Amino acid sequence: MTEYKLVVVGAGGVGKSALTIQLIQNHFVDEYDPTIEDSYRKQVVIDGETCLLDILDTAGQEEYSAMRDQYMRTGEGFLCVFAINNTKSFEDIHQYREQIKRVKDSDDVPMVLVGNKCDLAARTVESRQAQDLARSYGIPYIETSAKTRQGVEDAFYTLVREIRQH
């Protein structure tokens, strides 16, 4: 069975965790402690072939850590969750495209900028300037929501497809 890694990254309030656990348990966590490290995996099928996915939420255990940097070089699916109803998460994606570029030091990662928190009318981030941020690095732009399994499929799917080519 093939196996791909999903280097998840974003902010501490975008919905990257609830997106992961939701895909597995499917219960929308409304109180997950960000101070917990672990690797969630799934064994679903894309379109006929199964494929295990080692998703890493990467939280942070006190200072030092030294584990997120070694993961930017191991996994290749960069699902950079970006909460459009936060705005600060968007500015986080800005510098987040330099550390991943640091590790691979090649500017050629299967990058994917997602837009979590799209299940609402309050849109602080328009759907235009964001299109220019992703198109800048030649990466797809999506919008998911862990509070209703909406878009979660378009994110994990576009990630396994980009890695398939690379």
Ligand SMILES: Nc1nc2c(ncn2[C@@H]2O[C@H](COP(=O)(O)OP(=O)(O)O)[C@@H](O)[C@H]2O)c(=O)[nH]1
């Ligand atoms: N309405 C809504 N709230 C969400 C969604 N995803 C996350 N949240 C909320 O935003 C907070 C941050 O998510 P959490 O997974 O706890 O932290 P993360 O690690 O930054 O994702 C949570 O307390 C959720 O209640 C979503 O799709 N819709």
Ligand SMILES: [Mg+2]
């Ligand atoms: Mg978390």
